[PDB]
Amino acid sequence: AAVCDICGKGPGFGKSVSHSHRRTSRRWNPNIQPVRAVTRPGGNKQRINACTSCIKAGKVSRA
């Protein structure tokens, strides 16, 4: 759920920073959404995990 199946977009790693400046490890996960994508006009759908960026760019399509 943190890896896109089209572009390979993975999570980033970094730090959450407290007011007292305590640095704790955390992830920045990609916003990936389940999409029932198609392959040809009017065809069978297949569930894939696509990031919102790919959906916005039209790299996945629906019917």
């Binding site: 009017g42 916005k56 039209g58 629906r62 019917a63």
Partner: protein
């Protein structure tokens, strides 16, 4: 999202109108249903061609389907193809469903959609008469004989 309509949808516009909709509206409804196409270099021409083609190709009732069947089975058609040397009979590729549809029309026949042509099942790989089934409706299948001929 910028779209050109190919049908009349209420509260949006008429066939041929350019409209800007929300991405969810076009990507999940208008474009899947073929009510619109993405605005593009040729989209005005393509949208008008799509809508006019639809009205000609649409089938309505089982009675219209039986009329189409009884007309269509009364014909034998010619499909023109580019092919290897005659002993092989091999075609330099494959007859498409669009070829079968345009051949049926060119031979004074109905204007059917290409998804009704059961071409894969016909297994046309050589040249000669090959029967192809056209599924007008769930209960109405017509059989057509195609000559495949070297161009």
């Amino acid at each position: 999202m910028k779209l050109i309509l190919t049908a009349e949808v209420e509260h949006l516009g008429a066939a041929g109108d350019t409209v800007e909709v929300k991405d969810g509206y076009g990507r999940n409804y208008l474009l899947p249903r073929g009510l619109a196409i993405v605005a593009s270099r040729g989209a005005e021409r393509q949208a008008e061609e799509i809508r006019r083609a639809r009205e000609s190709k649409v089938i309505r009732d089982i009675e219209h389907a039986n009329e189409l069947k009884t007309a269509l089975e009364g014909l034998g058609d010619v499909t023109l193809s580019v092919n290897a040397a005659g002993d092989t009979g091999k075609l330099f590729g494959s007859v498409t469903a669009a070829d079968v549809v345009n051949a049926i029309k060119k031979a004074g026949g109905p204007n059917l959609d290409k998804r009704t042509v059961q071409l894969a099942k016909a297994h046309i790989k050589s040249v000669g008469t090959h029967p192809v089934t056209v599924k007008l409706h769930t209960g109405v299948e017509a059989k057509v004989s195609l000559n495949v001929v070297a161009q």
